[PDB]
Please model this.
Amino acid sequence: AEYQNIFSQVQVRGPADLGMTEDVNLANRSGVGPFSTLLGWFGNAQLGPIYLGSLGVLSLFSGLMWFFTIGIWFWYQAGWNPAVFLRDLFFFSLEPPAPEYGLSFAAPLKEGGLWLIASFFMFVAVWSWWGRTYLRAQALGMGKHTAWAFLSAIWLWMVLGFIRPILMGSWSEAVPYGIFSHLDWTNNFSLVHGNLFYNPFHGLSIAFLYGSALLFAMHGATILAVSRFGGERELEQIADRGTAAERAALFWRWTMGFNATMEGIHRWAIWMAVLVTLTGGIGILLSGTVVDNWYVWGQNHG
Amino acid sequence: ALLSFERKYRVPGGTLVGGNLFDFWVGPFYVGFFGVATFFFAALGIILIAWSAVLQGTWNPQLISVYPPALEYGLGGAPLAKGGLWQIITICATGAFVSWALREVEICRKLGIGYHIPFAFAFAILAYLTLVLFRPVMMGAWGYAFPYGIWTHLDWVSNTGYTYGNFHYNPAHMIAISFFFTNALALALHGALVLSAANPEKGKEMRTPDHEDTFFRDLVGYSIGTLGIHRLGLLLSLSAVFFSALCMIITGTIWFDQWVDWWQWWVKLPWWANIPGGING
Amino acid sequence: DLASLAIYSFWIFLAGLIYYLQTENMREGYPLENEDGTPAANQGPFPLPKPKTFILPHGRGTLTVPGPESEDRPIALARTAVSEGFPHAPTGDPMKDGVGPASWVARRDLPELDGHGHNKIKPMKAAAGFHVSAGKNPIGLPVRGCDLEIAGKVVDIWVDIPEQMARFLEVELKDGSTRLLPMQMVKVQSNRVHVNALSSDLFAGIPTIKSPTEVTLLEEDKICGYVAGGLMYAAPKRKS
Ligand code: BCL
Ligand code: BCL
Ligand code: BCL
Ligand code: BCL
Ligand SMILES: CC[C@H]1c2cc3[nH]c4c(c3C)C(=O)[C@H](C(=O)OC)c4c3nc(cc4[nH]c(cc(n2)[C@@H]1C)c(C(C)=O)c4C)[C@@H](C)[C@@H]3CCC(=O)OC/C=C(\C)CCC[C@H](C)CCC[C@H](C)CCCC(C)C
Ligand SMILES: CC[C@H]1c2cc3[nH]c4c(c3C)C(=O)[C@H](C(=O)OC)c4c3nc(cc4[nH]c(cc(n2)[C@@H]1C)c(C(C)=O)c4C)[C@@H](C)[C@@H]3CCC(=O)OC/C=C(\C)CCC[C@H](C)CCC[C@H](C)CCCC(C)C
Ligand SMILES: COC(C)(C)C/C=C/C(C)=C/C=C/C(C)=C/C=C/C(C)=C/C=C\C=C(C)\C=C\C=C(/C)CC/C=C(\C)CCC=C(C)C
Ligand SMILES: COC1=C(OC)C(=O)C(C/C=C(/C)CCC=C(C)C)=C(C)C1=O
Ligand SMILES: CCCCCCCCCCCC[N+](C)(C)[O-]
Ligand SMILES: CCCCCCCCCCCC[N+](C)(C)[O-]
Ligand SMILES: CCCCCCCCCCCC[N+](C)(C)[O-]
Ligand SMILES: CCCCCCCCCCCC[N+](C)(C)[O-]
Ligand SMILES: CCCCCCCCCCCC[N+](C)(C)[O-]
Ligand SMILES: CCCCCCCCCCCC[N+](C)(C)[O-]
Ligand SMILES: CCCCCCCCCCCC[N+](C)(C)[O-]
Ligand SMILES: [Fe+3]
Model:
């Protein structure tokens, strides 16, 4: 076959793109990192710059703290033995306090308190990273769409680790920090709630997850198919529709009898994605708080 | 019937079969040979489902279910009412999906664009064919395929999954799930990114691609670029479906015990298999 | 109960959202038209949305959508049948007339600008200091058409400065002038660049640009359309 636009045939390079200034405090920006010829076959070669800042630093530090609290506990569970550490890596787990401690912070270090400390570092890493998605857009005079979408993911997270436990009346309802154990939690959660397949919000969540693969497949493929007409320059096609945008739209119109625009597709996208965690969070939040058994709920239709 | 820019594109040519016989539209819809084939397969398939519903004795869409032949039939033909209808409907569905894709190719040819869309759709078809054709053939029976019913198809997912314990431990399923989750993440971000530029703070000028790169580099120290993100979403979602097919083509064939036990090979490696302490000692 | 209230509310929200999403996607190409240019009788159940206004940067004005929709160009096609829904035959040479897969849109006859108001795409020989950094360097290679004949030689790469990416090869013809070929329509091999879309004798036909060191949205559309259109219209002379 002829050229397909999955990998570039020819890379070009020029001076390091330090970026748009706008209201960004450039004091807080790194300089570039190295150029990856490897990455540049597919996307951009340039690494950096990144933007530091106080929140940046706080989030990053708190994030590591979280990772290290879980890690210390892992080592300790390995009895400090490096070869046991690697062996049982996916089997280690930092668990929340037992039910009897309810929502109190009393729980002893080895018996729930360490989970809480890690949860604290996580709570501040994430929310401060969110402030970051907002402020970085602000500094550049852009819309707040990223911070808005991030909030959907945050919602499910919040519901799993924080809102549901509080509503359920105990931290023991929350998710353990571990590879295999978080899966076991996932499977038990469903079992204990009458099988999540009867939770209408689990169903919708699945529709949007599958929907996102369908849509990004469709959009990704469409843009590459019209990249020979400059299709990937999406903003200039928004401001000044070209033959790329027209052939794009007409492909879908001829196929399935309707179509999008160069801006509107990105609205289908954002909403397909955020709806995953949006409905998902609601599905989980209602579980155990309002519905004990989804199968039972589904028999009364509600 | 036409978009304000459509007419210039509605020229003759690009068909794969039948020259200009079916080279025409119906409202917005292109037809072509494969438009016609699609209608035939889809209509047959729907009629056969309706018949199946009459034999099953219900018109409720929550109830209608079309099951494959029981395992005793192996790979033979079952009597119509005991799985044969499932078999003909499955031929029809494949007929319709493949026809749909080939129609998409005809459209691509008319429009002078790349073939990426039908090629991407081909992965979805392959996943379908994995569940209903490849895996059953490999396992010796049509009965391993999923039934065609809104709820019953979900029974099959559950029963199949739990047949191997907690399906979470299928390693190929873990990779698949990761591509799905990463895709949804990237879709959210690509969408948000483009819209945040096209729709800046009140009264400001539209931002540029430079601002998009800047925003992301600022946030995480990298930006894949605009060609890259569209390559990325394509890759992520196609990979999700590839590893979905893989994770099932291997279940009940090369591996058929509890998936959790597959992980034992790591733990039982000579050099640490016996060291005490940790979880497994 | 609350779960029922929640699911029922969500379905209402979702209908509204699909409505919002469908209307948002009608800001171009609408209202629908008959094959002759006039508003169609049947417009569908979704209305057009209230217009929105994009402030363009670099003083280039605004875009308001939806708004009056016009091709702003002649369209050399004619009906081939007495009823709705059939193909329209080109009345001239569809490559030259810019119809079918050779179509172009009449976009602004200015260049895309970067975030700083400089030209987004420049020839590399005028981009300080861009260079080929990986892969076979096409500059200097003979250019082969799908008739397997040489049509010229690559004399430069046109690059997207802010995205540091190759967009066109500038190709010199037997007569000393050049043409841009879209990067996505050439195959860079080791001893040649191959162009499947065009036979060699169609290269003089590529729409020329008006200033030799920049390119406009309008000219880009004309170049890409012409070259793509070759896949259908050059096929009698191919041989792939
Ligand atoms: C949704 C319902 C369940 C659950 C269901 C499942 C199922 C089922 C699976 C996962 C899987 C994943 N889950 Mg989980 N998952 C839960 C929510 C979480 C949360 C959280 C709430 O913050 C996190 C961080 C994780 C992250 C993990 C990853 C280990 C893995 C890949 C996810 C991914 O591609 O992300 C997006 C990709 C990114 C770009 C970022 C993530 C990269 C990874 C490496 C970071 C996550 C943790 C990290 C510290 C791993 C350390 C590795 C070693 C210990 C050193 N899960 C909830 C409780 N999850 C899959 C897996 O393979 O597990 C083994 C899998 O099959
Ligand atoms: C993919 C892996 C599993 C799978 C496991 C799950 C699980 C788990 C769930 C579903 C659910 C869905 N599955 Mg399933 N199911 C699979 C097989 C498929 C196949 C197929 C291969 O042909 C089809 C058509 C469906 C479609 C269905 C939908 C009824 C529902 C929403 C899906 C969705 O938004 O997709 C994303 C794509 C879009 C957003 C595009 C929309 C296309 C949909 C609406 C087409 C529906 C067709 C359906 C009514 C069949 C009628 C055909 C007519 C006779 C023409 N499944 C296999 C067996 N499926 C969810 C549900 O709630 O079911 C009750 C759910 O929780
Ligand atoms: C046996 C298992 C049960 C069931 C258990 C449950 C449970 C429990 C849950 C799901 C959930 C979901 N299920 Mg289920 N699931 C079932 C079977 C299925 C099947 C199938 C059978 O084919 C499918 C396709 C799905 C898939 C789905 C998803 C649509 C959904 C998760 C959305 C998501 O994006 O989370 C992934 C995204 C997140 C978790 C958000 C991430 C949050 C951010 C803030 C975390 C950042 C981490 C960061 C700090 C880490 C840093 C590392 C970096 C590298 C730097 N389920 C069966 C019946 N499922 C979730 C749901 O919403 O249910 C309603 C959920 O809680
Ligand atoms: C209790 C159940 C088990 C389990 C059961 C298994 C089983 C069994 C399967 C999966 C498979 C899936 N599981 Mg699992 N898995 C579980 C829970 C999880 C969890 C979770 C968070 O808990 C998640 C995220 C997932 C995720 C995954 C995905 C990797 C995969 C489904 C996507 C897919 O195959 O698409 C592929 C795409 C398709 C099949 C759709 C193609 C349809 C196209 C070709 C045509 C349809 C068009 C037509 C009908 C439309 C109508 C026309 C209208 C006009 C629209 N599983 C639990 C542990 N899982 C499935 C898989 O990998 O299959 C390959 C699978 O069979
Ligand atoms: C439907 C919505 C989907 C979604 C949305 C979403 N997620 C997002 C965003 C949005 C739009 C945000 O803008 C935000 C983001 O900035 O992304 C780039 C984010 C994000 N989602 C992320 C993860 C994530 N999202 C997921 C879920 C989803 N995200 C959904 C699928 C998942 C899953 C599926 O479990 C994961 C795990 C991050 C990439 C980012 C949030 C970043 C964050 O909150 O960080 C806080 C903690 C730290 C800053 C440090 C963590 C500790 C690390 C171990 C340190 C790494 C740094 C180190 C110095 C490097 C050293 C390297 C070595 C490890 C080799
Ligand atoms: C490869 C990544 C993802 C992907 C890609 C993808 N899907 C695509 C496309 C691509 C690029 C197409 O271009 C095509 C499209 O035109 O999109 C609008 C399509 C498409 N994906 C669709 C659905 C779909 N895709 C799926 C998902 C995926 N598709 C993957 C996640 C799923 C999931 C996740 O379950 C579904 C439900 C359709 C909207 C469309 C194909 C439409 C089509 O082929 O129509 C022709 C045939 C008919 C109109 C009906 C035929 C009826 C049959 C004869 C009888 C029905 C039998 C059936 C087996 C019953 C099933 C019962 C269920 C309850 C289980
Ligand atoms: C090599 O070794 C070293 C030590 C150097 C480093 C290695 C460390 C390792 C191996 C770390 C590995 C970590 C792993 C495996 C982590 C896995 C994480 C997973 C899978 C978690 C998934 C679920 C997480 C959820 C749902 C978390 C939700 C958290 C919240 C919502 C926070 C709630 C806040 C609480 C309870 C604190 C309350 C305080 C306030 C604000 C009042
Ligand atoms: C809005 O679009 C997005 C980009 O921004 C322009 C990205 O770039 C990425 C990140 C992609 C990759 C390949 C990171 C790999 C980099 C290193 C350091 C190895 C994602 C997901 C994305 O959604
Ligand atoms: C997902 C990012 C990583 C992608 C790296 C893949 C490297 C592939 C290199 C292929 C080079 C193609 N070629 C020969 C034309 O140069
Ligand atoms: C998620 C992608 C993470 C990208 C990491 C950020 C790169 C910053 C590099 C600056 C340091 C320069 N260096 C490596 C040459 O020393
Ligand atoms: C951006 C919106 C895309 C629309 C997709 C909507 C599909 C509906 C899927 C049915 C889910 C059924 N149920 C019972 C589990 O709720
Ligand atoms: C959830 C899937 C339901 C199928 C309906 C999908 C909408 C496509 C309708 C196209 C419009 C037909 N038209 C233009 C002739 O009116
Ligand atoms: C969940 C996706 C729903 C897709 C259906 C929404 C639009 C279907 C057809 C829109 C109308 C097309 N039309 C007649 C305006 O050209
Ligand atoms: C074989 C699967 C069962 C056939 C489903 C019947 C087709 C009607 C359309 C399905 C959507 C369900 N709905 C909206 C009527 O409730
Ligand atoms: C964020 C872009 C990079 C892709 C990361 C996707 C997570 C799953 C990684 C598993 C990779 C397995 N693989 C393809 C190398 O075999
Ligand atoms: Fe896009």
